[PDB]
Amino acid sequence: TAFDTGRAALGENNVYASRDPFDRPSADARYIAGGNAGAAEVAGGSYLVDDGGASGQNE
Amino acid sequence: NLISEQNVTVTMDLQPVLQLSMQGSETVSFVFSQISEYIGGLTQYGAVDLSVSSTVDWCLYAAAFSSDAADAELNWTNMVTFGDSNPNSITNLPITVLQLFQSKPNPDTNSTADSPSFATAFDTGRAALGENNVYASRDPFDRPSADARYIAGGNAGAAEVAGGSYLVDDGGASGQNEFYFTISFRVVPALPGTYPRATSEDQGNTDETDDLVVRGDGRYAYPGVYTLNVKFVMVEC
Amino acid sequence: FYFTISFRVVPALPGTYPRATSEDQGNTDETDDLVVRGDGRYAYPGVYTLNVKFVMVEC
Amino acid sequence: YAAAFSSDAADAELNWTNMVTFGDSNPNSITNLPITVLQLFQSKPNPDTNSTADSPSFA
Amino acid sequence: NLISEQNVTVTMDLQPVLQLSMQGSETVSFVFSQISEYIGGLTQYGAVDLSVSSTVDWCLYAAAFSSDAADAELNWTNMVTFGDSNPNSITNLPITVLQLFQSKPNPDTNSTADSPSFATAFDTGRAALGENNVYASRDPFDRPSADARYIAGGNAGAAEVAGGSYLVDDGGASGQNEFYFTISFRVVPALPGTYPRATSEDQGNTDETDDLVVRGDGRYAYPGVYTLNVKFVMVEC
């Protein structure tokens, strides 16, 4: 979600804070491009190669 | 769709510019020593001029204040009491006594009082009673009512003059013509000692006379000296 | 391969911006100053922010 | 190319991001300034341009 | 558990913003040439106004200093001595003579002196003796005591006003109402030549009169000119 003004959103853009950033965050945390469980994952690929998600910035 | 980008952040601030530049003498002194001066009073022409520089809509007004006016009684500040004593003499002169004449009418006026501004020329005798009297208030730091007198503006949000500067050549020519107001002072006492041109203090705009003969029918101003301060205030509209 | 860009903003003494144009394409000629919008409006005193992105794309 | 974006521009209204409002209030004052206000000058014309708009570049 | 990572370092600085913008005339001149001026004194309205921009809790006070005040004697700086000589004439005028009036009371005050700030209106004669007198100090670069006069703050860490800016519309409306203080100067000499409104110099807030008749019972101010400097200082709380 886009940046909001004032005390309206309170969570949709805040960063994920952790005292140990070298383990998988909980399922209720924020993942940029994935999911905690073994079923919420994105397929392997490369940004340079023209994958299903167009090529370059798109995927 | 390879992307290489660079971003620059632009910050624009429109700081408000509010300037009221006054030229003239910060002390205006009226000295009465001749009989003619007592009966007719000093008329001072072009005592103070005001120039306005602004960015937003502005309204300029003139208010009158004194030490006495701070305690809800709008009378002049008695300064020295010449003489010994007189039962039929009161040292309580109305603040409204001072009369002002403006060289222009109100540019954008929306009012229907006795006179929206000090536009009309000075009159003689008890004829006008309000068209040139000053606006008296016990608190000159708030917007006067819509029936009061504004020099270059109006109380409501629709009676305002556009922003500009007197130096710049605006729609109203340039210089004295639009954003430049010259004010002339006049006080007329009477030979008996009364002030037949004083008006009320509730609004400072009404017509009913507030001279000393109204108060006592035989009173007159005590010999001495008195002080009054005039504030020219411009407020964003 | 070296482009130098100079910025300029021209407000007006009343407070309008007579050089603003449309937003449909950003290239048209029709003026979008505040007098077009209201005929008596002017910019409120204050501060405002805008971001500029220089983007290069493969052709 | 160069594009202009702001927090307001994210919601289909291409106006500058109001930041602080100096002053109290005015009915005839609007805090909605066009994004197009900013003007840019480029030191060169477009090297390879194929367009017929008002002006292909900030030349 | 193969790991590929990239790190970015974020540095945030909150630089303190402390701005005191004064509008008016940096020279305030009182000229006494008439008898009325001598007995009652010039009262100047709206001489200097102060606007405060701040990020943290701040307290604003006004102190008075002079060349003489640098050597532990808080008297005005004698400038020129008009006349020849007089045994019963002393050129040592109290710094406390100058009187200041503030348009507002102290927003957050925790004090029980004669008057926490210059809030009360100007008084006439020997009646108030402290409610409008200036704060005199031989070193104006430290926090005055809790019994002194603060324009917009308090000595302790609990009597402070929140950070803000006069331009921005804060809780206290916007503009003149909260972060904008207008100060009016007034000095009242006497026809004999004394200053019946002068107070002590130990705190500058006490009530005991420090006029010349207290010092000698027949002294009066020597004809001439004198100088005094006023410092408006804002300090983080």
Place of tokens 């130096």: B167
The answer to whether C53 and D3 are in contact (CB under 8 A) is: yes
d(CA B21, CA B50): 6
Q: Flag if B10 and C7 touch (Cβ within 8 Å).
A: yes
Q: Of B10, B16, B164, which has the smallest distance from its Cβ to C45's Cβ?
A: B16
What tokens appear for E15 in the block? 């630089």
d(CA D40, CA B131): 55
Residue E102: list chain B partners with CB under 8 A.
none
Q: Flag if C57 and D14 touch (Cβ within 8 Å).
A: no
Phi first, then psi: give them for residue E6, nearest 5 degrees: -135, 140
Element (H, E) at E43: strand E43-54
The answer to whether D39 and C9 are in contact (CB under 8 A) is: yes
Question: E190: closest CA among E30, E83, E32?
Answer: E32
Residue E124: list chain B partners with CB under 8 A.
67
Burial bucket for residue D47 (CB in 10 Å: 0-12, 13-18, 19+): exposed
Query: Which residue of A3, A50, A57, A58 is the best one to mutate when testing the B interface, meaning the one whose CB has the most B CBs within 10 A?
Result: A57
d(CA B154, CA B110): 6
Structural biology method used: cryo-EM
Q: Flag if C43 and B15 touch (Cβ within 8 Å).
A: no
Instruction: List subunits contacting chain D, requiring 3 or more Cβ pairs under 8 Å.
Output: A, B, C, E
Q: Residues, chain D, total?
A: 59
Q: Of C4, C9, C27, which has the smallest distance from its Cβ to D38's Cβ?
A: C9
d(CA E91, CA B100): 43
The answer to whether B149 and B61 are in contact (CB under 8 A) is: yes
Give the DSSP letter of residue B97.
G
Spell out where E2-57 has E strands.
18-24, 43-54
Question: C43: closest CA among D33, D6, D36?
Answer: D33
Q: Flag if C27 and D58 touch (Cβ within 8 Å).
A: no
Q: Flag if B2 and A57 touch (Cβ within 8 Å).
A: yes
Residue D29: list chain E partners with CB under 8 A.
none
Instruction: List subunits contacting chain A, requiring 3 or more Cβ pairs under 8 Å.
Output: B, D
Q: Taking an 8 Å Cβ-Cβ cutoff, which residues of chain B contact chain A? A: 1-3
The answer to whether E22 and E52 are in contact (CB under 8 A) is: no
Q: Within 10 A of B151 (CB to CB), how many other CB atoms are there? A: 25
C14: closest chain D residue by CA = D29
Residue D18: list chain A partners with CB under 8 A.
none
What tokens appear for A49 in the block? 């190669």
Q: How far is CA E168 from CA D25, D43, E54, E173, in A?
A: 12, 39, 11, 9
A50: closest chain B residue by CA = B1
What tokens appear for B85 in the block? 């004593």
Q: Which residues contact B234 (CB under 8 A, 6 or more apart)?
A: B18, B20, B52, B54, B58, B59, B60, B61, B152
The structure was resolved to a resolution in Å of: 3.5
What tokens appear for B13 in the block? 């601030």
Q: Which residues contact B46 (CB under 8 A, 6 or more apart)?
A: B24, B182, B184
CA A18 remoteness from chain centre: 16
B3: closest chain A residue by CA = A57
Pairing status of strand E43-54 against strand C46-57: unpaired
d(CA E148, CA E133): 11
Q: Flag if B168 and C13 touch (Cβ within 8 Å).
A: yes
Question: E203: closest CA among E124, E119, E120, E111?
Answer: E111
Per DSSP, the three-state class of C39 is coil
Q: Taking an 8 Å Cβ-Cβ cutoff, which residues of chain B contact chain E? A: 16, 65, 67, 70-71, 79-80, 141, 225, 227, 229, 231
What tokens appear for B26 in the block? 């910060």
Per DSSP, the three-state class of E78 is strand
Helix extents (H) in chain A = none
CA atoms within 13 A on the CB side of A9: 9
Element (H, E) at E220: strand E220-221
Task: State which amino acid sits at residue B107.
Answer: P
Q: Within 10 A of A56 (CB to CB), how many other CB atoms are there? A: 15
Kindly compute the dihedral angle of the four CA atoms of residues E24, E25, E28, E30, in this order, to the nearest 10 degrees: -90
Q: Of B10, B13, B56, which has the smallest distance from its Cβ to D29's Cβ?
A: B56
